[PDB]
Design an enzyme around this catalytic site. Structure first.
Site, PDB file in Angstrom:
ATOM      1  N   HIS A 191     -19.344  14.540  37.523  1.00  0.00           N
ATOM      2  CA  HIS A 191     -18.982  13.400  36.671  1.00  0.00           C
ATOM      3  C   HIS A 191     -20.098  12.335  36.664  1.00  0.00           C
ATOM      4  O   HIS A 191     -20.748  12.131  37.693  1.00  0.00           O
ATOM      5  CB  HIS A 191     -17.673  12.810  37.217  1.00  0.00           C
ATOM      6  CG  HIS A 191     -16.972  11.874  36.281  1.00  0.00           C
ATOM      7  ND1 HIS A 191     -17.345  10.556  36.128  1.00  0.00           N
ATOM      8  CD2 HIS A 191     -15.896  12.055  35.479  1.00  0.00           C
ATOM      9  CE1 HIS A 191     -16.541   9.971  35.258  1.00  0.00           C
ATOM     10  NE2 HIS A 191     -15.649  10.857  34.855  1.00  0.00           N
ATOM     11  N   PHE A 195     -15.295   6.764  27.656  1.00  0.00           N
ATOM     12  CA  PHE A 195     -16.636   6.290  28.057  1.00  0.00           C
ATOM     13  C   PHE A 195     -17.249   5.161  27.227  1.00  0.00           C
ATOM     14  O   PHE A 195     -18.184   4.499  27.679  1.00  0.00           O
ATOM     15  CB  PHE A 195     -17.619   7.458  28.203  1.00  0.00           C
ATOM     16  CG  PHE A 195     -17.175   8.485  29.198  1.00  0.00           C
ATOM     17  CD1 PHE A 195     -16.634   9.692  28.774  1.00  0.00           C
ATOM     18  CD2 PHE A 195     -17.267   8.231  30.563  1.00  0.00           C
ATOM     19  CE1 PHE A 195     -16.200  10.644  29.693  1.00  0.00           C
ATOM     20  CE2 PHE A 195     -16.845   9.181  31.489  1.00  0.00           C
ATOM     21  CZ  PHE A 195     -16.303  10.387  31.050  1.00  0.00           C
ATOM     22  N   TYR A 214     -11.224   2.791  30.942  1.00  0.00           N
ATOM     23  CA  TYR A 214     -11.830   1.783  31.820  1.00  0.00           C
ATOM     24  C   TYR A 214     -10.779   0.747  32.232  1.00  0.00           C
ATOM     25  O   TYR A 214     -10.038   0.247  31.378  1.00  0.00           O
ATOM     26  CB  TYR A 214     -12.991   1.066  31.115  1.00  0.00           C
ATOM     27  CG  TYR A 214     -14.237   1.900  30.896  1.00  0.00           C
ATOM     28  CD1 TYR A 214     -14.909   2.486  31.971  1.00  0.00           C
ATOM     29  CD2 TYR A 214     -14.759   2.083  29.615  1.00  0.00           C
ATOM     30  CE1 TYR A 214     -16.055   3.249  31.772  1.00  0.00           C
ATOM     31  CE2 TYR A 214     -15.910   2.838  29.407  1.00  0.00           C
ATOM     32  CZ  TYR A 214     -16.553   3.415  30.488  1.00  0.00           C
ATOM     33  OH  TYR A 214     -17.691   4.163  30.294  1.00  0.00           O
ATOM     34  N   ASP A 231      -9.057   8.490  32.415  1.00  0.00           N
ATOM     35  CA  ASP A 231      -8.231   7.432  31.829  1.00  0.00           C
ATOM     36  C   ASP A 231      -9.111   6.256  31.381  1.00  0.00           C
ATOM     37  O   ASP A 231     -10.302   6.247  31.681  1.00  0.00           O
ATOM     38  CB  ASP A 231      -7.120   7.001  32.798  1.00  0.00           C
ATOM     39  CG  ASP A 231      -7.633   6.211  33.976  1.00  0.00           C
ATOM     40  OD1 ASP A 231      -8.759   6.481  34.451  1.00  0.00           O
ATOM     41  OD2 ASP A 231      -6.897   5.314  34.441  1.00  0.00           O
TER      42      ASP A 231
END
Length: 233
Positions: free
Chosen positions: A197, A87, A76, A74
């Site tokens: 991740h 990102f 930031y 989702d």
């Protein structure tokens, strides 16, 4: 002004680029429903991230040119960080979120390029990378607060539409959650790159050393497709 009002009232063809408008037609009702949801959030005195005009931003670049999928969970949660591409941050953001710093570290180690000047991933999106979050909005400073609110159907549609094309696709799947997306991609001409991740919580468990960028390009070339120019200023 562009945002939740357009999501409720305007057709997809006026929200996203032409190829994406056709590809996402099945979730046209759901995008409208999400506009409603966001309208309800604002009415209740709550905010959401990213900016309304950026919510559907990942679908504003040519669907026909998408060759790489990079999935995030989702946006930031830090206000000003989310810009509608997984990102990515705005070119003025300093320092960048730790997840992005980790991505850039691997970028330099893998490709041999210098550290980017800023955290703007727009060039990747302009060059055929889908920077897709599974959930497209979030309440400020409250991670995963819009999970299960209806975005999942929309972003699943995006993934499945990509897989439905004849064209080759490389899916870069970071983390356990992104890995569970493999079944969505199985019907297509697709190869997955899987690793932990880039979040600081998990990056040093295998994200570093994974070389996802050069590997994605090798796979694309092997599948007969144009590689991605990963270079950032």
């Amino acid at each position: 002004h562009h945002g939740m009002a357009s999501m409720t009232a305007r057709p997809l063809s006026e929200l996203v680029e032409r190829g994406w408008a056709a590809a996402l037609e099945p979730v046209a009702d759901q995008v409208a429903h999400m506009g409603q949801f966001l309208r309800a959030e604002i009415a209740a005195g709550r905010r959401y991230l990213p900016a309304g005009s950026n919510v559907l931003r990942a679908f504003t670049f040519p669907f026909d040119n998408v060759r790489v999928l990079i999935v995030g969970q989702d946006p930031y949660p830090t206000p000003g960080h989310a810009v509608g591409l997984s990102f990515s941050v705005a070119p003025d953001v300093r320092p960048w979120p730790r997840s992005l710093a980790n991505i850039f570290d691997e970028y330099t180690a893998d490709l041999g390029y210098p550290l980017p000047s800023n955290g703007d991933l727009t060039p990747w999106a302009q060059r055929g990378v889908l920077l897709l979050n599974r959930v497209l909005t979030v309440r400020p400073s409250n991670p995963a607060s819009h999970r299960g609110k209806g975005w999942e159907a929309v972003t699943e549609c995006a993934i499945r539409a990509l897989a439905a094309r004849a064209a080759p696709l490389v899916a870069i799947l970071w983390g356990r959650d992104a890995s569970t997306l493999k079944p969505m991609l199985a019907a297509g001409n697709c190869v997955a790159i899987e690793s932990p991740h880039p979040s600081p919580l998990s990056a040093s468990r295998g994200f570093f050393g994974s070389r996802p960028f050069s590997r994605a390009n090798e796979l694309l070339v092997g599948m007969g497709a144009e590689p991605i120019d990963w270079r950032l200023p």
